[PDB]
Amino acid sequence: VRYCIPGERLCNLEEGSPGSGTYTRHGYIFSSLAGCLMKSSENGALPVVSVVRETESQLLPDVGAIVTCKVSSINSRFAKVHILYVGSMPLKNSFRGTIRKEDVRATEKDKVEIYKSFRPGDIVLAKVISLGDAQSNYLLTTAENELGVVVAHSESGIQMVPISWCEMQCPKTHTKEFRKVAR
Amino acid sequence: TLSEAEKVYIVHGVQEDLRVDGRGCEDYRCVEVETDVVSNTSGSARVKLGHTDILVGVKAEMGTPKLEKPNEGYLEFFVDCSASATPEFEGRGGDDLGTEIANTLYRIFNNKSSVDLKTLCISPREHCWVLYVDVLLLECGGNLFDAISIAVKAALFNTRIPRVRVLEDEEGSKDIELSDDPYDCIRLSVENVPCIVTLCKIGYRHVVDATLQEEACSLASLLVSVTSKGVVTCMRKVGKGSLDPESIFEMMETGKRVGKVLHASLQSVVHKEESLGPKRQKVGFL
Amino acid sequence: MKETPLSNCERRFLLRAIEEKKRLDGRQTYDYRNIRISFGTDYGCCIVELGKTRVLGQVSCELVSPKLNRATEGILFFNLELSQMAAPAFEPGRQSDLLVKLNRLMERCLRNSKCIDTESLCVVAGEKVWQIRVDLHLLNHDGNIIDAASIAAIVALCHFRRPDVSVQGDEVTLYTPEERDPVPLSIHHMPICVSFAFFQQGTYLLVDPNEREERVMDGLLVIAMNKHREICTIQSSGGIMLLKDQVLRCSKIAGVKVAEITELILKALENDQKVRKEGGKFGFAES
Amino acid sequence: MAMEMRLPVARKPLSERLGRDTKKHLVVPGDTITTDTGFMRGHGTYMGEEKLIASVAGSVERVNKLICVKALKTRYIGEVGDIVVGRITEVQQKRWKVETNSRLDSVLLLSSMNLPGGELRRRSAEDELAMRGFLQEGDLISAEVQAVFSDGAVSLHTRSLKYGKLGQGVLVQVSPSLVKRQKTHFHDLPCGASVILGNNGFIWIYPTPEHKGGFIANLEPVSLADREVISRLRNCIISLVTQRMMLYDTSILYCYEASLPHQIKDILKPEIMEEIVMETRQRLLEQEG
Amino acid sequence: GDHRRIRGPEESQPPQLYAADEEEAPGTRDPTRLRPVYARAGLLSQAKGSAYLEAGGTKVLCAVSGPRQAPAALRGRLLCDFRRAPFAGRRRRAPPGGCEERELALALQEALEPAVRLGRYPRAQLEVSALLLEDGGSALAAALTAAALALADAGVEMYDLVVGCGLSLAPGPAPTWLLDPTRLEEERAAAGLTVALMPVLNQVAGLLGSGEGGLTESWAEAVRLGLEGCQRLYPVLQQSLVRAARRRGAAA
Amino acid sequence: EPLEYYRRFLKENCRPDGRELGEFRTTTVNIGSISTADGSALVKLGNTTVICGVKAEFAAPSTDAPDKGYVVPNVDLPPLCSSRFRSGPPGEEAQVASQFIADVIENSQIIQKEDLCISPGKLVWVLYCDLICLDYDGNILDACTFALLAALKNVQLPEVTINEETALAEVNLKKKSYLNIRTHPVATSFAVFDDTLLIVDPTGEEEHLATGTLTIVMDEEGKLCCLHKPGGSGLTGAKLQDCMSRAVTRHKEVKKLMDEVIKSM
Amino acid sequence: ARAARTVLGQVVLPGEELLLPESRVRVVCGPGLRRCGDRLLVTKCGRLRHKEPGSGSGGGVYWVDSQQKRYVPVKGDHVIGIVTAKSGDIFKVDVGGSEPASLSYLSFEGATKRNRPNVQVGDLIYGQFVVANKDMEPEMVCIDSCGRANGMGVIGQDGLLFKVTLGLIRKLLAPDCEIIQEVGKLHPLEIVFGMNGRIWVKAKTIQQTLILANILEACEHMTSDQRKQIFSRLAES
Amino acid sequence: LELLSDQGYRVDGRRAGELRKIQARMGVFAQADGSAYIEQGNTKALAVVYGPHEIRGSRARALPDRALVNCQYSSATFSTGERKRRPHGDRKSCEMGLQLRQTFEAAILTQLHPRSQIDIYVQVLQADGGTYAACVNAATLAVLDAGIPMRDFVCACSAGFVDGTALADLSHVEEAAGGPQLALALLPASGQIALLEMDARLHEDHLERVLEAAAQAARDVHTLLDRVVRQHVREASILLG
């Protein structure tokens, strides 16, 4: 174990290769961060050096993921969300995703309707597909019956229960709201 | 701004000791100097260096001296970076560069040996002179600081403060006595007022009067302030880039030589003009 | 926020009704709206409301070191604020053009016309002089301001009273409104602006335009006048091409209008004095 | 080294050195062009009270029945076949936004730019993402106009491989009313270089190659004997423009041939400028007639 | 009158100017000496990265509000706000400033842009905020070093660290270059100078200077001296960062 | 899911950090850390931090009260405290806190302005007390008041004299004089959740997700200088007397602390 | 907190809770009310009002006849609008609310890509909302669901558009209004009432239009004197 | 000191009905799209017009119908003998901006350059009276040099009233005396006024006089300007071919 510093060299190119958090100058590698270094080894015997600030080491929500999020803004076209839990490990770096109109149910019907599936201020979980290019806009999908809304607060302040596939109700009083209930 | 291949062209040109204007790396261009442009000022000057046109006004007003230095007066600098230079300046966008240039001009004159301020004192702690210098930008074509400095010096040389006797009297009554001799107005020496010199580094070679197209191609620029003797008042560094420790020395030596030459030429020119007289007609903006 | 856009329907209807010389509420072209002048409890406050446009005016005093160029006569400080209650668009620090033009115009009109005596309000020539500031506030915005702002400033500066002062040498003694009776100001003549609005490049002209008429007009001619027929300022805004006879006629109008407004103002002050001389902290005048 | 200062000398107006007394019809705003039965108006005029009134300062031109004006300074209005040189300013999801001396922001649609070699199939998202890595913001393109929109803007394209992106070279910005409207703006001079003369005021000067579409950057050095020529041409063009004369092959070639005695730098000093321009002008005038 | 702060008096001059005495002069010392340095990174919590540096009467903070969305055009930015607390220095100045704060801010930006690599932080602006609690000598150099520490702490990429050093000139008959001085050695001085470099690759990043006088050779000696001082100072900062990283490893 | 996660602890009569709903966090001070200033005081409540520097200058009084030495506070919440603040002029929270500090200084009457007049009508002291936040983890008013009081006890001023011949005043920076302060106002904070749940010394999040806040300054002799009650879900005197008791306790604690410090010098 | 039946014609003020009698019978919470458990919170000052359906099972309905100026996008309301801009397929129209509503180029009666409607910026419209909610921007349409514009679409031109209070409309549109009936006898006309306090009128001449607009904006409290005054004026136009 | 000697002369040595020799030029700065310079006595205005170009930071103000005129005013510190600071941002330079803007939006004929900035800039180097009109005229010459279409020379000047007579093209002396001064700017061809500012007290029947006097002074200024412009155009064309 050794903690490194943004100026100190680490190794020749002949004794390793840059993985991340480094840079190269004449015949040498030079760190670029205050953190811990690690030289992984492939079956090829040539090491890959890298440097990490394990405070927030690294996370990546990949395609076949199951990620929760919160519905902030909506439109007749799409509904935007913020990423909270990638799997079960939260991430203070809240990424921002989107859910399209058709990419809401496995049936793919155009008859779907956002305002009867989602509302601003409820938690869902979905599967990402596209990472995004410019703004890293995650595009999430809920084309499955065990997906979508799980918790949803009532007209004013009550948490509702997922009665059926597209119905939810508050336990205190009686009122049938419409969402894309999960499971 | 400009592309990448043009930058390659320019840097290999410099490395070869040629430039788009077919001049070397130690060669300014014809700088048109003029003095006594505006009339309502106690001093004035104008410079046209290639495609950068600067005006400079100098007003000698009467004000209270500074408590820490009542035995002598002071210079103040204001800098109107008129949007007429590039439209990207307005009531707020030019304040940055104006402030930068003004702070430089101050840093050039916290020297105590440039303008003999003691000569600007009438009655210590009671009255004193104040030199309000007002720089006015009209184009931006590079080598801005050197031209501004040359203008400051030509304006100082062209400054004519009147003599005043401030006589005290009891029961708090003060009187100012003028000298009705506009020909008998005093003149402050400029044998030490320094010129700025902007050495921009391109590739592995340094350059003077760095035209815009070459400033965009550079990474660092050392500003030096030299007097006709050879000393170096100020030594600042500007640029979003790095700079080696050895090249500093070459830059400084070159600034020394260029300052000698520049001050010689300016002194000769302005003596010439002062000799001519009203016969010159003061061609300005016409 | 933002102002609701203007429909082409209203625009065309207005232009046509002008062509036919028909205003909306039912008045002619050479007519103001019923202007009311109401007073407060504190000497120097006036709320003047013409139709729907209400404007408040307060007048305050201070003693301060004068400025060297004029060490004998005092100072005067105007300021007009466009309160967000006047209209949505009037966010702070956004509608600055209107503020600037109004304030410069009002300063010019009152100050440079020498309406009050900046000399009478001297106490110690070189050390202490008065300082009269007047803060106008726009409460409701329906149409014509300059007229309202001016009527308010004038009613105030004619309905204001200073704390009396005694002096001997350098010994200056201020006193309270309860120890002596505050002294009024010194006016020479009361100017009040008059606003004309041009439609169709100059063909038609209106008086006291409403808000819509200000939105479908191209040009604005302000004219300051007195009861003695003395031009104090005139200004053209809106980028419009007028002529000579137009301004001449507008002036011959402003004459009568200002005479009448002045009569009203004087009646209002008379009535307010009568009330306070009978028990009551108000004063009211109606066009 | 060498530095020089000099006072400003007063101009010598009226260009009396020529002595022409032109046979033109100059005007200025408010001036009343000939008022007659149904004369059509063009760029540089308007109508008032049944009277044709100029709008801009210059000479009037009366084609068979059309009355137009030909100002002396404008910004490049868009034609339909004029070649052009342009510096890029933005890269929008769909296209590129380019800066000419025009009253708006010229436009190069992604559909227009030629592809590496002749690999022409169609434009997809992959091309939409190479839209940046190939034509960087700030680069230069030598194109020709495709069309002019009703809002004034100019959509331009690249007909062949002679067009496209430019090498390293050098550039000048002059007024667009100082390049004769003619053909073959693309010249390759015997001096050892080549030049592109925009219908706008952007001139490009590049050394001429030996092989004979910008998809590769030949960021190689340039022989001194091919940079000195370029710099001399640059200064000669600046001279020509500073004296307000037209600009094309023979003009620049003859200013070149004139500026060999006077070295590569001393031909911006107004005296040298003026004498070179006078020599060139006189020899053009006398040889052509 | 400012309407965003409390109504105080119009003007207010300090008492010192009304004093009567010849202030004490330092005298002699080892010109190639350095003050005792206390540098620690990781002080502040609510900030992605922070650092604190004390050298004599000098006491400086720096914080780094990290990437905040806002090739050669999609290249990062860093805007630096230098600010001396109104309770530093013999005299008081209103918080705003507007004369020298901005000059030293430009200095920080010009000395940091090189070290930091901004290609990896596109479409982003790093808000660096320095604060000078007490002035006791070389100030701009301490600020450079502290901003470097705070950046390296927040984990922004770099090429090398930034080490500063301030010098002054003794106005005596035999003028010697005084290294890492005090506010007294700096107000009773003829010339001042400030170097800042990246010691691994041995490259200056931003320097500055001024003089009642001087000359080429003197300035050159000053430069090399400041370089040596920065070299001798670097290891302290190294150890400080290592220590903070160890504390992070301890927390989890 | 922050609020829920927090109600769980609240109903377990605790907090997610280890505080028993009625106790503060580690409170510490440091006196005389700064020479350039007349008075200096650093305060920190765990993560929260504040620093006061009090400078002394001369000035001419008003005309309504010549024998009044001004005391001008100004609070500074620079962007390095938290990201919710931006480089520029002062926002709203800084200004509110400034007015709070001034109201305190004026009502508690810790200091007699008359004790700052040298030559009435001509000179009088002005104490520029500049406070600076450095970590806004929460409860900044308590820290501000406590640092103000600490530095304002540390401050010792010089002595001045007047010469009729010169008609000017001279200072003696060798001899000095402390500054008498009569009352020792301490501030105690509260965060009121939905209806009846009052937590003490609320940190950042606890203030973000709260229905209301409250602050109460409690002088030593069983009196109050300020009851800062900006909005909230409401309160009855029964949820208020308890806060006053706890405020008295906190007064005792911090005054003991400050005494120990001024005696450990 | 008492006798919902005894204050059905009284002035209720916000904060007031009122409770209703009963196993029970479904009822509906009006616009100015709100539900707290089994009680009715009041949210707007008003002369309370009640109604019951012709049946006996529906229960009832309650509300408050609150007067005000600002409008809120509601569903199934006929509304005048002012096209503010056009973005590609949809063009945005102002209503007088929080944010501008949206139309679609193929919502007008009989329109497709090869047949677009004539809508120019500044043009005014008479549509109705199909999605009016607090969470999403409101979309409107100028065609009944069946597929016919039963009076919707662009208004036209050559008229006067003014603005009044909402309660004034809610009163005028009543089948038992006297003013708008008496006006049908003096001179002809044709007018659009928009539930956002915005009214459109047209007649033959212009004097009449102006008199009419003044009547309408005053008819909330007109005196018999002014009433017959403006009536006589119309008779003399 | 005095303003009108009993003979009819002024201080400067000119009758009431005449004015001071304007000396101008067109083409000062080449890095722009239009530039000018004028000295209407001791005054020295300087104009610049960066042509109809693209709007950046569109900020939803690019008028689609017409063009966007943005004119900025500035009075240098050393203009007056009394030094002043903050020449921009003041409450007077912005009023001058409004005035110039509403004049040239009237004249500049914007209906042909929609969605485009015409950036006008004015700097006053020396002020000795008639400080607005010099700027109007310099900006006019600039516009013309930039080939921007415009209905007519928008020529401006000032008049005043002293001893029952009207003066033309006031200076600072009689401008400081406090008498009525009426500045205006009109389009000669049509006889239409584009701007009419005025500031001091005077009777009404004394209005037509100063008004027509200012108008005639503006006509004279028109003559002088147009002679300059014609020399410029002629020289340029001759050099072309």
CSV table of N, CA, C and O in Angstrom, one decimal, chain D residues 195-217:
chain,number,residue,atom,x,y,z
D,195,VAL,N,-3.6,30.7,-54.5
D,195,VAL,CA,-4.4,31.7,-53.8
D,195,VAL,C,-5.9,31.4,-54.2
D,195,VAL,O,-6.2,30.9,-55.2
D,196,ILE,N,-6.7,31.8,-53.2
D,196,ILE,CA,-8.2,31.6,-53.3
D,196,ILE,C,-8.8,32.9,-53.0
D,196,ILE,O,-8.5,33.5,-51.9
D,197,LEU,N,-9.6,33.4,-53.9
D,197,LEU,CA,-10.2,34.8,-53.8
D,197,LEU,C,-11.7,34.7,-53.6
D,197,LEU,O,-12.4,34.5,-54.6
D,198,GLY,N,-12.1,34.8,-52.4
D,198,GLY,CA,-13.5,34.7,-52.1
D,198,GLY,C,-14.3,35.8,-52.7
D,198,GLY,O,-13.9,36.9,-52.9
D,199,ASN,N,-15.6,35.4,-53.2
D,199,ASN,CA,-16.5,36.4,-53.5
D,199,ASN,C,-16.9,37.3,-52.3
D,199,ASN,O,-17.5,38.3,-52.4
D,200,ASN,N,-16.6,36.8,-51.1
D,200,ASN,CA,-16.5,37.6,-49.9
D,200,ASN,C,-15.1,38.1,-49.8
D,200,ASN,O,-14.3,38.1,-50.7
D,201,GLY,N,-14.8,38.7,-48.6
D,201,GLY,CA,-13.6,39.4,-48.5
D,201,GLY,C,-12.5,38.5,-47.8
D,201,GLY,O,-11.5,39.0,-47.3
D,202,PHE,N,-12.6,37.2,-47.9
D,202,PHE,CA,-11.7,36.3,-47.3
D,202,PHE,C,-10.8,35.7,-48.4
D,202,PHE,O,-11.3,34.9,-49.2
D,203,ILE,N,-9.5,36.1,-48.4
D,203,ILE,CA,-8.5,35.5,-49.3
D,203,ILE,C,-7.7,34.5,-48.5
D,203,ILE,O,-7.3,34.7,-47.4
D,204,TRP,N,-7.4,33.4,-49.2
D,204,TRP,CA,-6.6,32.3,-48.6
D,204,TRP,C,-5.3,32.2,-49.5
D,204,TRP,O,-5.4,32.3,-50.7
D,205,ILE,N,-4.2,31.9,-48.8
D,205,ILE,CA,-2.9,31.8,-49.5
D,205,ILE,C,-2.2,30.5,-49.0
D,205,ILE,O,-1.8,30.5,-47.9
D,206,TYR,N,-2.0,29.6,-49.9
D,206,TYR,CA,-1.4,28.3,-49.5
D,206,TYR,C,-0.4,27.9,-50.5
D,206,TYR,O,-0.5,28.2,-51.7
D,207,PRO,N,0.7,27.2,-50.1
D,207,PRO,CA,1.7,26.7,-51.1
D,207,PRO,C,1.0,25.7,-51.9
D,207,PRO,O,0.2,24.9,-51.5
D,208,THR,N,1.4,25.7,-53.2
D,208,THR,CA,0.8,24.8,-54.2
D,208,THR,C,1.5,23.4,-54.1
D,208,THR,O,2.7,23.3,-54.1
D,209,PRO,N,0.7,22.3,-54.0
D,209,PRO,CA,1.3,21.0,-53.9
D,209,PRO,C,1.7,20.5,-55.3
D,209,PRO,O,1.6,21.2,-56.3
D,210,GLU,N,2.1,19.2,-55.3
D,210,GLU,CA,2.7,18.6,-56.5
D,210,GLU,C,1.8,17.4,-57.0
D,210,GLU,O,1.9,17.1,-58.2
D,211,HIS,N,1.0,16.8,-56.1
D,211,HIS,CA,0.2,15.7,-56.5
D,211,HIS,C,-1.1,16.1,-57.3
D,211,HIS,O,-1.2,15.8,-58.5
D,212,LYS,N,-1.9,16.9,-56.7
D,212,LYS,CA,-3.2,17.4,-57.3
D,212,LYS,C,-4.0,16.2,-57.7
D,212,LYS,O,-5.1,15.9,-57.1
D,213,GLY,N,-9.0,15.7,-50.4
D,213,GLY,CA,-10.0,16.8,-50.2
D,213,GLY,C,-10.0,17.3,-48.8
D,213,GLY,O,-11.0,17.7,-48.3
D,214,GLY,N,-8.8,17.5,-48.3
D,214,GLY,CA,-8.6,18.0,-46.9
D,214,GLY,C,-8.9,17.1,-45.8
D,214,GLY,O,-8.8,17.5,-44.6
D,215,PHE,N,-9.2,15.8,-46.1
D,215,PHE,CA,-9.5,14.8,-45.1
D,215,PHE,C,-8.3,14.4,-44.3
D,215,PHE,O,-8.4,13.6,-43.4
D,216,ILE,N,-7.1,14.9,-44.7
D,216,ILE,CA,-5.9,14.7,-43.9
D,216,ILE,C,-5.1,16.0,-43.8
D,216,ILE,O,-5.1,16.8,-44.7
D,217,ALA,N,-4.5,16.2,-42.6
D,217,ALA,CA,-3.8,17.4,-42.3
D,217,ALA,C,-2.3,17.1,-42.5
D,217,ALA,O,-1.7,16.3,-41.8
